[PDB]
């Protein structure tokens, strides 16, 4: 596993020893090379994971997450170099250092064998994101949003630590393999109920679960393009990965304690999908759609069936790619008009046709158009929920109806109609932005031909 970690570490002295006009080129090239190297982890087994050493291991669940995390960094560098042009060399290198540190922390988090190390890295990921949001954000709210990002997570994650060090004091180990093999049932008691709550809510906050989701429309909106990209694509999936990992020790209590969270998630799908219909901010609309999509993965993990787990993995990967592309597309318009109001700039299909095509593809993939992996994950989760309960089909389908509504609306408001007259500074799209959307969307369509690569260990 060190063959991926060490080059990511070497990215730092490389960036700090590069020329003032050569940091972006070298960083992008070597991050793409690291992604190519990380592609080798997709060769998984059918019975047990890839145990590299006592500290790091890779399963079929963490391999696609690793690949996506390594792939996102070149895209973040490509999207960030536009608005950081007037920045000084030292601060450019500091921003690239923040991105590299975030990638390294995510790489170590997705492969840690022991739960305490996983928690340590999973919490260490907060610092670079907070620094990026609160230092390179554009508006005055970026400070407050930062606080919302910091204290929402910690208030959920601090009890988790108290749980973890407790478990090692009773079972003797926190290694995932030992925990899986030596699993024991959870008795129905208040102490076990609160231990279940402590081991779960830390991942519910990061999803975010409906009710504890207020930090996301702030953090995603006020963050820069790379911050929002890393927040939507990868940082939201940490909760899902941790919950899928830790639900082993929670049975059979998960049958009883999941009802409030299940109800919250199935109603939050409708609530957030309806909120998306009336949103004057485009970035806020994308952020709320992210919560609407993550509620489905919450339900899938809670119902605890193999089809649900496969659907959750596929939906996590697909949503990461789709949300990253949508945030990039919104940022392209923002860098022209310097406003996030959706109705300010209209009829952009006439002026930017290829960008309109990118918008159409992103919108179609967002609403789970078959045979995209978004649709595969959504349909697997729907079938698992229908097996869990038939009446669920009333809600999920309703959500689908709303999902296609606010998506195409978002496409109609910005791309169709007539252009606003007073705006006259809409320059043709650069090759960098078009390449960014192409690199966002081509793997998304490529993953259709090989879905088993992103279906998790339950395949």
């Amino acid at each position: 596993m060190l063959k991926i970690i060490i080059p990511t570490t070497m990215l730092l002295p490389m960036t700090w020893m590069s020329k003032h006009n050569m940091i972006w080129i070298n960083a992008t090239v070597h991050s793409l090379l690291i992604s190519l190297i990380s592609l080798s982890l997709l060769n998984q087994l059918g019975e047990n994971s890839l145990n590299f050493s006592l500290t790091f291991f890779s399963d079929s669940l963490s391999a696609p997450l690793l690949v996506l995390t390594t792939w996102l960094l070149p895209l973040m560098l490509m999207a960030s170099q536009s608005h950081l042009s007037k920045e000084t060399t030292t601060r450019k290198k500091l921003y690239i250092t923040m991105l590299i540190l975030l990638q390294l922390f995510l790489i170590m988090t997705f492969t840690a064998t022991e739960l305490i190390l996983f928690y340590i890295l999973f919490e260490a990921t907060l610092v670079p994101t907070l620094i990026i949001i609160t230092r390179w954000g554009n508006q005055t709210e970026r400070l407050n949003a930062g606080l919302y990002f910091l204290f929402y997570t910690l208030a959920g994650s601090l009890p988790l630590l108290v749980a973890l060090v407790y478990i090692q004091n009773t079972t003797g180990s926190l290694n995932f393999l030992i925990i899986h093999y030596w699993s024991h049932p959870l008795s129905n008691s208040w102490s076990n109920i609160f231990m279940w709550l402590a081991c779960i809510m830390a991942f519910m906050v990061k999803m975010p679960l409906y009710g504890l989701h207020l930090w996301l429309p702030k953090a995603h909106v006020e963050a820069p393009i790379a911050g929002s990209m890393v927040l939507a694509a990868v940082l939201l999936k940490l909760g899902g990965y941790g919950m899928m990992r830790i639900t082993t020790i929670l049975n059979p209590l998960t049958n009883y304690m999941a009802y409030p969270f299940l109800m919250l998630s199935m109603w939050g799908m409708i609530m957030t999908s309806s909120i998306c219909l009336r949103q004057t901010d485009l970035k806020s609309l994308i952020a709320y759609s992210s919560v609407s999509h993550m509620a489905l993965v919450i339900v899938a993990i809670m119902i605890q069936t193999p089809w649900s787990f496969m659907g959750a993995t596929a939906l996590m990967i697909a949503h990461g790619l789709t949300s990253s592309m949508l945030f990039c597309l919104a940022n392209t318009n923002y860098e022209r008009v310097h406003s996030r109001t959706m109705i300010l700039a209209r009829g952009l299909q006439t002026l930017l046709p290829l960008m309109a095509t990118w918008w159409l593809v992103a919108s179609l993939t967002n609403l789970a158009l078959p045979p995209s992996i978004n649709l595969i994950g959504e349909l697997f989760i729907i079938t698992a929920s229908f097996s869990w309960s038939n009446i669920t089909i009333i809600l999920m389908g309703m959500n689908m109806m709303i999902t296609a509504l606010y998506s195409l609306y978002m496409l109609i408001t910005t791309q169709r109609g007539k252009y606003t007259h007073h705006i006259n500074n809409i320059k043709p799209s650069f090759t960098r932005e078009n390449a960014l959307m192409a690199l966002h969307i081509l793997p998304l369509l490529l993953l259709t031909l090989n879905p088993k690569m992103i279906l998790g260990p339950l395949y």
């Binding site: 047990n48 030992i178 093999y181 030596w182 639900t247 605890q304 069936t305 193999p306």
Partner: protein, 175 residues
Amino acid sequence: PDSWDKDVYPEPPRRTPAPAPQTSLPNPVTYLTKIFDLLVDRPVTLAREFIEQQHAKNRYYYYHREFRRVPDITECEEKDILCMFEAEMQWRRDYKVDQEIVNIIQERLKACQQREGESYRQNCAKELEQFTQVSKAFQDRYSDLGAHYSARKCLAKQKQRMLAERKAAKEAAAA
């Protein structure tokens, strides 16, 4: 063809009727079939025979991997991790093999339904019975284990089923 086994993928003797014409009009289907044979089939078989001659010049083989039988979870101690790991791997392999057996039976059923045409309800009772038996066995073994399944959970399910059967037998013997 010899690519697959005919005992595992059976089919009826393929009775077909000989052409018996009644009118003097020409058959367009025969003319088009001759055109397809002369224009499409012959170049394809020529290219394939060339490819086969090329393949025959380099003959190398690949082997089916054989796995030894290791003790199951029933023979492992409570906290002995090594035999537990080996038994769990063997159980996962057996689970995959059972899945593929169910897949083969389902393929038989699908081929039956398509082949028999309008008499599929009567001429495919054997396939339906085989699928019902295999599905019942698979449901008894692996159903309701859920995610995070293991050999221990399957053993517990089998023990519970055996207790239920023993109680039912004792109740029946009291009459």
